[PDB]
Design a binder for these strands. Structure first.
Ligand SMILES: [Zn+2]
Ligand SMILES: [Zn+2]
Lengths: 111, 147, 94, 97, 62, 83, 83, 98, 83, 109, 94
DNA sequence: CTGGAGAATCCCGGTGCCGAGGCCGCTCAATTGGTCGTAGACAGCTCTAGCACCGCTTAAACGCACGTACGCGCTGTCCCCCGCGTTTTAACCGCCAAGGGGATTACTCCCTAGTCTCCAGGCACGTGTCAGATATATACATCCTGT
DNA sequence: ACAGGATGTATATATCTGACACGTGCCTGGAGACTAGGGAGTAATCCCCTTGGCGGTTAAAACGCGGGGGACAGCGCGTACGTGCGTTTAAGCGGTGCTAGAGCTGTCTACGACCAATTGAGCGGCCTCGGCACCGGGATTCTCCAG
């Protein structure tokens, strides 16, 4: 008898693979040695970012009365939120389109 | 201050006592409580009465309590130290549940052990391999200690 | 028969945690994988530069806190740091 | 008969194309252009269809952004018609020239 | 005497084994006795020759 | 609306701390809890809704920048009928 | 092995017009259809000359999607959805 | 007789003057006061190296000169010679700062 | 402990005029000065925030030149002359 | 008593320190192992670039009738050359000033 | 008593080989040092990413050629590659 | 459009200072010589995907007429900005003094690399059903000319 | 403003289908236990640069006044671009067929990490004078108003 195998992700209550993140860090030539809490912190940060994107994407999808998230929904979610827009200002999403906006000068006007 | 919430929960428990289980402070310290539960019917542990310990951390209801068994028992998801491997105590904690639900979940795990994440590998092996053997041994140990 | 790795399983789990009844297209999953890889590389590169600047040789959670503070803007960074410290605390508590 | 006054069809096209996500350039001539451009750096090169699609996506996004900037420049110049002066100004300000 | 754990000070005289020290730690704080270990059960303090004001350290819990 | 225009003490108390609602914040899931309990349970456990598990992270970050967190209407109503 | 230079005319006037329509342009002067296709080839030359040198360093004969993605990334134009 | 130059004639000569000199154009003491005032909002009682304050001024002045070049180009594009706050906004928006 | 404020007026109107003159600006409107104050304040806030983070990561109370250099370099405006 | 020490820069007939560059590479966390010719190639490239910039800056200085190169001369040398200007388009030089130019519309006529 | 390093000696040697009768200010020397470090970091960072992309673990002159081709524009890149190859050839000769 | 006053700019020369340039410890980081494991070079084999072609549909491109709205020029106003003089203020320089904090050295010890063994979590592969697309016939909002 | 006609545009219902959410076998990468060693935390000390202060000079900022030129609204005119309709034309699809090169595996060896011993190249210090700043003064140019 040795022990049962509990994943570090389950220890931290995460979903992203702490062990995989640790392997990537220590195989990515980022530093000579890697601390113990660094993968735990990084996995939590990545999970939070993905969840934050997905909540808005799902809200956009349900506002469009569809049940599957398509890249159009991701683009609509990203470009509406100011924080995420500033984080991903230099990123192009394939099949994403653009946010519908028309300058008020071009709209017709008279009487 | 968790004292208001602890006292309110105790007041509600006194207002609505459980059927097979019982708990409460065993002294002036509201943080340290003893829980008394009976073996659920149609279970190998039926007949025995188990006593539990409680240690409330100073953040309740926003943190799970420190609760374990003071009665020796034969269960996969329970270690020899009486600790209980349960999500509402580890991950599924929420400030919006009552202690009675916790006790009912404990009784359910007593009736429904989870060998996927046990605390004693041998007990999980027996539960997966010979359900009758687990039912016999749990009953024997319930009679030996819980009775 | 080279087995390749991605984050599709974890992305799907988080999606089920947030919206219990919403699917995701295959092409959107690839976009999420690219996003995850990009953010991972940004943060790891920033932490490596911090460690090299301070003449260290170890990347710890201390470096990643600073890297997140530099990269993410404002309230997003605040929430990310709150999430990361909580996870590290829970991991060390066990 | 019937005749829409100028501008309305353009506005409905703006609303239509800002709601869809399709590729706006014909695939075969775009591929021919890509192969023509690449044929001088190296001869007899080969391309993955995924690579060509990536190039087209990036190019279309870049052009759309350039037009978004050049429209604001023309509006700032108190006009509604885009003209190459606006494209030049936008390219110059964005540090591309 | 005095005993340090690395923190609730102080604890039993050189007369109680590791099990009783862990039980009192659990009573005084709520940390499980068996979780996680003692770094410096059936062993005592005199068996390890633990003097007063010694610095102790206190895995399985998952 | 909270309800109501006269939130009798049982409703005027927080759903968690059970004390009188101090600067209550209305969640997108329409749940009402005081500013202390909210500002604790937000970064305390999981950023989720304690009642119906609703994620509030996007709503929270939306409202924090504009300082639109505190429900002004109910917070004023409580001051009119309660201390 | 015989590609001529006429392919720049492949980007037609209606194609450029609908690109501008997506970009939000009301009306287009006639001189734009040359300026835009002048700009586009400059952009494509910059991207492709970086993709092809990646492929050369990899000692390959075909241009993969990752080569284009890397070439775009090194120009501060990261693209999602292809790796 | 009071001799006066035509408006803009001295503006051109001082443009030639300041495009040839490399000195810092902002006053160092108020710039340092501003830098410390801004830094108050992140950590209290911070201390600055004089070289760090100089580096901040050197970067800020170059950034402002670069911004002014583009905002002058926009004003010229609008067929006028007086730069107006809309021109600065247009330049910052095209550059992607806003 | 030496709390100070209202330093933004230290950037005098003649100083802004001198900067614009080096920029190659002939005539200046009256509304330029306030907006330039705002732009400079935004830029300095964005740079000092990263500089202070770099300093406090190394756990010292003194903002050095290398911290400012790194804060500028990570914003895409590399600056020479300070090591 | 083995042999006379010859620097790798002297072996390649360079000026920049090949040994120092090699040390910087392997202590820079760039890759696990470093090829032998990598420092040689990198030192050659850096020496060539410095030579180019110094040539242009010296020309700018002698056009200003001075003997000591100052940051103003470096700025004038960099901004005039198109290649270097594009290479260092995102670089701010302290005490550099700007290239003197006035838009033709502003000139009086 | 920390021994800090720069490239001032080598910059001065190149300056004397180019303009034998020209001085350089102290501040200009610092600018040259900053430029040298910046370009060195650019090239090394590009070469490291190339080695990672092509599943290698050794940075050789083959990667540095491509890094220079990616970074330096046009004629400058061509001249730099020509200069580097000659130096490597001479070094490998002896 | 052609000259003179004047204001600014440029230019030459004598002067004094201090930072560039050179010299000298001197030590430590570069060099040199071995050894040893392995990352990569190279041959070889497979089969995936890229290239080439043809044929039919038809949607999209292309060309033409028109007339209307928009770009562009002109003109007058007037108000806001520039040039300038006078007054005011605080930046700037020199200097002294206190000390807080940055920069070293020692030491120890705890955290992380490395190795080993074991197993389950994630990957490759099927698979069937349902979210979504497409068609069609609606209601319904929208524009545009005439009133 | 208004009404009706023509025209897109959103909506509901029906049906297909293929892409996804799921399941299973499996294997290799993650977890666990362990030891060893050096990276870093902590303490202690030193002194250097930061901060704070003061007084005097004066360069720079603030204020004000007049006037002029430029921003701006308006107007008139021409043209070129959008809108529509009819007539080409390759894009697109689909299908088939071929093979070049991408990808993998298996060797084997040249090469780069590693370590120990040796010394001299670069860092620090220490100068010294000359390139450059400055001050004054004469010479040149450029602007502007009267003509
Ligand atoms: Zn409450
Ligand atoms: Zn709720």
């Amino acid at each position: 008898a040795r022990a049962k195998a509990c994943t570090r992700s389950s220890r931290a209550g995460l979903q992203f693979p702490v062990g995989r993140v640790h392997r990537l860090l220590r195989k990515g030539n980022y530093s000579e040695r890697v601390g113990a809490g660094a993968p735990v912190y990084l996995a939590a940060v990545l999970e939070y970012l993905t969840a934050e994107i997905l909540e808005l994407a799902g809200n956009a999808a349900r506002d469009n009365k569809k049940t599957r998230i398509i890249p159009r929904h991701l683009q609509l979610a990203i470009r509406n939120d100011e924080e995420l827009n500033k984080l991903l200002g230099r990123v192009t999403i394939a099949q994403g389109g653009v946010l519908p906006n028309i300058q008020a000068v071009l709209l017709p006007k008279k009487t | 201050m968790a004292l208001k919430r602890i006292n309110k929960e105790l007041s509600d428990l006194a207002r609505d006592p459980p059927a097979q289980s019982s708990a409460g402070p065993v002294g002036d310290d509201m943080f340290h409580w003893q829980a008394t539960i009976m073996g659920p019917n149609d279970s190998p542990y039926q007949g025995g009465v188990f006593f539990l310990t409680i240690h409330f951390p100073t953040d309740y209801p926003f943190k799970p309590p420190k609760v374990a068994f003071t009665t020796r028992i034969y269960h996969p998801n329970i270690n020899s130290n009486g600790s209980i491997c349960l999500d509402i105590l580890r991950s599924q904690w929420s400030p919006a549940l009552t202690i009675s639900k916790v006790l009912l979940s404990i009784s359910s795990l007593l009736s429904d052990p989870n060998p996927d994440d046990p605390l004693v590998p041998e007990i999980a092996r027996i539960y997966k391999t010979d359900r009758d053997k687990y039912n016999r041994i749990s009953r024997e140990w319930t009679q030996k200690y819980a009775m | 028969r080279s087995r390749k790795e991605s984050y599709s399983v974890y992305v799907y789990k988080v999606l089920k945690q947030v919206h219990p009844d919403t699917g995701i297209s295959s092409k959107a999953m690839g976009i999420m994988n690219s996003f995850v890889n990009d953010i991972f590389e940004r943060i790891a590169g920033e932490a490596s530069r911090l460690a090299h600047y301070n003449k260290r040789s170890t990347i710890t959670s201390r470096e990643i806190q600073t890297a997140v503070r530099l990269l993410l803007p404002g309230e997003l960074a605040k929430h990310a740091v709150s999430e990361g410290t909580k996870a590290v605390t829970k991991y060390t508590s066990a | 008969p019937h005749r829409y006054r100028p501008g309305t069809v353009a506005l409905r096209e703006i609303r239509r194309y800002q709601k869809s996500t399709e590729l706006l350039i014909r695939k075969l001539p775009f591929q021919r252009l890509v192969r023509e451009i690449a044929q001088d750096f190296k001869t007899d090169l080969r391309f993955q269809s995924s690579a060509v699609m990536a190039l087209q996506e990036a190019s279309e996004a870049y052009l759309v952004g350039l037009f978004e900037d050049t429209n604001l420049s023309a509006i700032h110049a108190k006009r509604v018609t885009i003209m190459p002066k606006d494209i030049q100004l936008a390219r110059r300000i964005r540090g591309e020239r | 005497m005095q005993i340090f754990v690395k923190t609730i000070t102080l604890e039993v005289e050189p007369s109680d084994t590791i099990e009783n020290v862990k039980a009192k730690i659990q009573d005084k704080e709520g940390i499980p006795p068996d979780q996680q270990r003692l770094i410096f059960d059936g062993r005592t303090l005199s068996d390890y020759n633990i003097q007063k004001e010694s610095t102790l350290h206190l895995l399985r819990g998952c | 609306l909270p309800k109501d225009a006269i939130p009798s003490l049982s409703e005027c108390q927080c759903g968690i701390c059970m004390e009188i609602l101090v600067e209550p914040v209305t969640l997108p899931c329409n749940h009402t809890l005081c500013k202390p309990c909210f500002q604790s349970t937000v970064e305390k456990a999981s950023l989720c809704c304690p009642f119906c598990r609703r994620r509030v992270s996007s709503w929270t970050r939306y409202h924090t920048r504009r300082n639109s967190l505190v429900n002004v209407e109910l917070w004023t109503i409580i001051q009119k009928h309660y201390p | 092995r015989k590609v001529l230079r006429d392919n720049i005319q492949g980007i037609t006037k209606p194609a450029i017009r609908r690109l501008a329509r997506r970009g939000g342009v009301k009306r287009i002067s006639g001189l734009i259809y040359e300026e835009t296709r002048g700009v586009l080839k400059v952009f494509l030359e910059n991207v492709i000359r970086d993709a092809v040198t990646y492929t050369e360093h990899a000692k390959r004969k075909t241009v993969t999607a990752m080569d284009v993605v890397y070439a775009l990334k090194r120009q501060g134009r990261t693209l999602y959805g292809f790796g």
